[PDB]
Amino acid sequence: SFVKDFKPQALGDTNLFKPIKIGNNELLHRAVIPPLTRMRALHPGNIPNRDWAVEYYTQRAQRPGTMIITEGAFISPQAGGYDNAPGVWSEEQMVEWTKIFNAIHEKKSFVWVQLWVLGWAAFPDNLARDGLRYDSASDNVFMDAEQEAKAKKANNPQHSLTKDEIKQYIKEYVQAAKNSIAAGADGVEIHSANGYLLNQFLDPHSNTRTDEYGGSIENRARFTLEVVDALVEAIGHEKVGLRLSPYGVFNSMSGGAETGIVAQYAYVAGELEKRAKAGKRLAFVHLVEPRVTNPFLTEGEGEYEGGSNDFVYSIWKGPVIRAGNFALHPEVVREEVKDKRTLIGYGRFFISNPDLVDRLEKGLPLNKYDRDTFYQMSAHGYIDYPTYEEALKLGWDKK
Amino acid sequence: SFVKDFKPQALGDTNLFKPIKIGNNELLHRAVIPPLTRMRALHPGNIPNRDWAVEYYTQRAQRPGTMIITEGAFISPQAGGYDNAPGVWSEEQMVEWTKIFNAIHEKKSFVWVQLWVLGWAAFPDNLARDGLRYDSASDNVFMDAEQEAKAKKANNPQHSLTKDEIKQYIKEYVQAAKNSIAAGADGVEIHSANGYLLNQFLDPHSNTRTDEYGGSIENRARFTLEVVDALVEAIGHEKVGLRLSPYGVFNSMSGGAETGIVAQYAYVAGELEKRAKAGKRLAFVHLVEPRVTNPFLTEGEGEYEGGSNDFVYSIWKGPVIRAGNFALHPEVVREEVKDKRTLIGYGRFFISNPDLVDRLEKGLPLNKYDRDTFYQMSAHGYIDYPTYEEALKLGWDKK
Ligand SMILES: Cc1cc2nc3c(=O)[nH]c(=O)nc-3n(C[C@H](O)[C@H](O)[C@H](O)COP(=O)(O)O)c2cc1C
Ligand SMILES: Cc1cc2nc3c(=O)[nH]c(=O)nc-3n(C[C@H](O)[C@H](O)[C@H](O)COP(=O)(O)O)c2cc1C
Numbered sequence: 001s002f003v004k005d006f007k008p009q010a011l012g013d014t015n016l017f018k019p020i021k022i023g024n025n026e027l028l029h030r031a032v033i034p035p036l037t038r039m040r041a042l043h044p045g046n047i048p049n050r051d052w053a054v055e056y057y058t059q060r061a062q063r064p065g066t067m068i069i070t071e072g073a074f075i076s077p078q079a080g081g082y083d084n085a086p087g088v089w090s091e092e093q094m095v096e097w098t099k100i101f102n103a104i105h106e107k108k109s110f111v112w113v114q115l116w117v118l119g120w121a122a123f124p125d126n127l128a129r130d131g132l133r134y135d136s137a138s139d140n141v142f143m144d145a146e147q148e149a150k151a152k153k154a155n156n157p158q159h160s161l162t163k164d165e166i167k168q169y170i171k172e173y174v175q176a177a178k179n180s181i182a183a184g185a186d187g188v189e190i191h192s193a194n195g196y197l198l199n200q201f202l203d204p205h206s207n208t209r210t211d212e213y214g215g216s217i218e219n220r221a222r223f224t225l226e227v228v229d230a231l232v233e234a235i236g237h238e239k240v241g242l243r244l245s246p247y248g249v250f251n252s253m254s255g256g257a258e259t260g261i262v263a264q265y266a267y268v269a270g271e272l273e274k275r276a277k278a279g280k281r282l283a284f285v286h287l288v289e290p291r292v293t294n295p296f297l298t299e300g301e302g303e304y305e306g307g308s309n310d311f312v313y314s315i316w317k318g319p320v321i322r323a324g325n326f327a328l329h330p331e332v333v334r335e336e337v338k339d340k341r342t343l344i345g346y347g348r349f350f351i352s353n354p355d356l357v358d359r360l361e362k363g364l365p366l367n368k369y370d371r372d373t374f375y376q377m378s379a380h381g382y383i384d385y386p387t388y389e390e391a392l393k394l395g396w397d398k399k
Numbered sequence: 400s401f402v403k404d405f406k407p408q409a410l411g412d413t414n415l416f417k418p419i420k421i422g423n424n425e426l427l428h429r430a431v432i433p434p435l436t437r438m439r440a441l442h443p444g445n446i447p448n449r450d451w452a453v454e455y456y457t458q459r460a461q462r463p464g465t466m467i468i469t470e471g472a473f474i475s476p477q478a479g480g481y482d483n484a485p486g487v488w489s490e491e492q493m494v495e496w497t498k499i500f501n502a503i504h505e506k507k508s509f510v511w512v513q514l515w516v517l518g519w520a521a522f523p524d525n526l527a528r529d530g531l532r533y534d535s536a537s538d539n540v541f542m543d544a545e546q547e548a549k550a551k552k553a554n555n556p557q558h559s560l561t562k563d564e565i566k567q568y569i570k571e572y573v574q575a576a577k578n579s580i581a582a583g584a585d586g587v588e589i590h591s592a593n594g595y596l597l598n599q600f601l602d603p604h605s606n607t608r609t610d611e612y613g614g615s616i617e618n619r620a621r622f623t624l625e626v627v628d629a630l631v632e633a634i635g636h637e638k639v640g641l642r643l644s645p646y647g648v649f650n651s652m653s654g655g656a657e658t659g660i661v662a663q664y665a666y667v668a669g670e671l672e673k674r675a676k677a678g679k680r681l682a683f684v685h686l687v688e689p690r691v692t693n694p695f696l697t698e699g700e701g702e703y704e705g706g707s708n709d710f711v712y713s714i715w716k717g718p719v720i721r722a723g724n725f726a727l728h729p730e731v732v733r734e735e736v737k738d739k740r741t742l743i744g745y746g747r748f749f750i751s752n753p754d755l756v757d758r759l760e761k762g763l764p765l766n767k768y769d770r771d772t773f774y775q776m777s778a779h780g781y782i783d784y785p786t787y788e789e790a791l792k793l794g795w796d797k798k
């Protein structure tokens with residue numbers, strides 16, 4: 001059915017429908033599909049889904065000039081730890097991603113691959129099976145109860161990475177970014193948000209190292225910045241984006257409770273503008289908003305109101321993508337896109353509405369999403385949400 | 400005469416006229432007098448002016464419950480370097496400040512002493528005369544042309560402070576804060592803005608040290624934070640304020656051009672809130688706005704619009720005083736004081752208008768200031784600006 005007491009608002013008279021150039025791509029509107037894990041990849045191999053993935057992305061690439069950031073894709077087997085999320089390291093995976101990138105490009109939309117490394121969010125037991133380490137920034141701070149339950153049954157204890165093994169992850173980031181561009185993606189987003197490995201090094205709670213990778217603002221940022229710099233040497237700055245969630249608490253990050261958190265993220269933004277002066281301005285910075293500090297909480301739950309992401313605009317002067325409970329708030333979006341360099345990511349309602357961009361443009365009602373199929377191994381809840389037309393033919397009231 | 404095409408606006412219906420508690424003081428309105436050097440102190444001795452200073456401050460303390468921050472006062476002779484600015488280190492100076500604090504308190508207003516240390520802004524030649532060093536954070540970066548002219552004629556070269564001599568300045572800050580409270584002041588503001596010594600250690604341009612006082616965000620903040628902590632042990636956190644000018648460029652500071660500047664100031668704000676959790680919340684944070692990056696430029700000149708001070712509010716959760724070209728902009732003030740913990744400093748128009756607070760409350764015209772007497776050794780341009788009544792009796796049109 002459609003979302004119930006939601007009064008939609010048409011947004012075609014705002015800057016969300018003005019064109020903008022992001023990297024090499026000339027987007028025709030500013031509503032982007034943020035990275036969304038759907039756990040339909042095939043095991044063994046972490047292979048993109050052979051039956052359903054091309055249709056899923058072809059459906060969401062239907063409005064020309066749309067920017068799509070894929071689900072997170074593991075850069076290597078050691079980066080992974082979930083059986084049904086995709087990778088971008090082997091020839092069998094890239095054969096299937098090529099077909100997804102060609103289908104999106106035949107629709108005249110764009111496709112950026114999100115590069116993912118789990119760290120302590122990985123299941124230690126899957127990893128133990130495959131012969132791999134359970135990695136994080138440190139060894140004396142765990143994610144939570146059941147993650148330490150997991151690890152000890154599995155006898156796969158949380159490991160602090162050596163400098164050596166941080167370098168190897170940089171090596172794999174470059175290869176996986178080379179692979180995504182060689183199979184035809186328009187660019188890559190470095191996932192450094194939502195509590196996964198690079199964010200575990202950025203956060204003072206998860207990073208109690210005392211070497212060059214821990215202990216100060218600058219050292220805590222060091223791994224994310226080396227990854228930026230290596231991918232910018234490998235494939236060019238106009239093909240790299242960075243995602244940050246300053247105020248997130250998902251996967252045990254500190255959020256607004258850490259008093260030093262704005263300075264930690266202001267430093268990363270200033271180093272990026274530094275590079276932008278020196279010629280290497282990243283295609284964009286993608287921010288998760290305090291409106292959503294945990295993506296497993298229903299919209300409106302877990303909103304952090306003691307801080308804001310607006311400090312990034314005083315520092316970084318390129319495009320920023322902002323995401324977090326914006327589909328149900330067109331009155332908030334109308335204000336945020338008066339800024340001429342701001343794009344809005346829509347996550348959960350792009351899951352239920354293949355044709356979201358038309359619905360935004362025209363103020364049409366919004367299909368409810370079914371949380372129960374976010375992570376099912378099914379076409380149901382994945383490729384069968386109707387467009388507005390089909391939804392009327394189905395009687396979602398109006399028939 | 401009155402300011403010419405200025406249309407005033409009455410502000411008595413805003414939060415500028417609601418009471419607020421700052422430290423121990425219950426202010427009756429939120430228009431504060433920011434620190435303003437007027438160079439009427441007597442040489443030798445840096446003695447507050449024996450003839451005119453009590454009247455100057457008594458005139459500006461006329462509206463009950465006003466917070467007044469004094470002109471900068473040197474904590475010791477090595478901190479100084481201008482002959483006619485006051486000090487707060489000797490018995491002869493404190494005899495005269497006592498009389499200023501008693502006169503302000505008989506008017507039922509409050510008085511906070513700004514503690515000043517010049518660093519590289521000092522005249523090296525006055526210092527050479529008196530046997531004192533020309534100090535700064537570093538020795539290979541100078542303030543400007545004529546300051547190095549000065550120094551070499553004077554044969555008094557710019558010196559990088561040793562740890563030892565940084566400790567001695569902390570010793571003198573505590574004594575001078577003990578002296579101000581013992582003579583009767585309500586509190587002290589630590590001057591760490593506008594390019595003077597503590598700001599030279601905070602700024603990456605002026606601070607090229609590689610020891611524990613330079614080289615990173617945390618080390619660059621170290622001297623300002625040790626001074627906060629020493630004065631909070633000495634006299635209590637509800638008697639200490641801190642002034643910061645993130646975006647200032649006066650006295651050769653970096654301003655918005657340094658990409659790392661917001662992170663440098665976000666770190667200082669986060670450490671202060673850290674302490675606020677641990678029980679020691681400073682009475683206030685005083686910020687100079689990007690609206691004024693050099694106080695020698697006429698209002699509207701040198702406005703920095705690529706950044707904002709609003710990031711401090713996501714981090715520090717106590718009172719903030721904001722200053723910078725707000726007297727000519729009541730439409731801007733009306734918006735800024737919707738925030739329930741914001742006070743507005745008025746510098747240059749509190750020089751020409753002893754009765755500014757009534758004029759703000761009622762929307763009355765504003766006396767022009769005479770820049771030519773900001774630093775003269777005269778009563779003229781100091782104690783003879785009229786109140787609105789006297790100005791009408793004088794015919795400043797209306798007679
Ligand atoms: C099912 C689901 C999967 C997600 N997968 C990812 C992911 O792979 N990487 C990522 O950075 N964010 C991920 N997110 C976070 C979203 O990109 C987004 O920031 C969050 O949902 C807030 O936007 P929303 O309120 O519009 O949905 C996911 C969110 C959901 C609900
Ligand atoms: C004559 C004059 C003397 C000043 N003296 C000081 C001082 O002693 N310490 C300080 O922190 N700021 C000093 N300032 C800066 C002001 O406090 C204030 O931040 C600046 O004037 C901007 O406010 P305005 O636009 O209202 O005047 C001075 C400014 C002027 C014009």
Ligand SMILES: O=Cc1ccc(O)cc1
Pocket residue numbers: 037072193194295
């Ligand atoms: O729900 C899956 C998920 C994956 C990666 C994220 O970044 C956030 C959520």
Ligand SMILES: O=Cc1ccc(O)cc1
Pocket residue numbers: 436471592593694
């Ligand atoms: O004009 C004098 C002056 C003194 C101290 C400051 O902080 C700023 C200006």
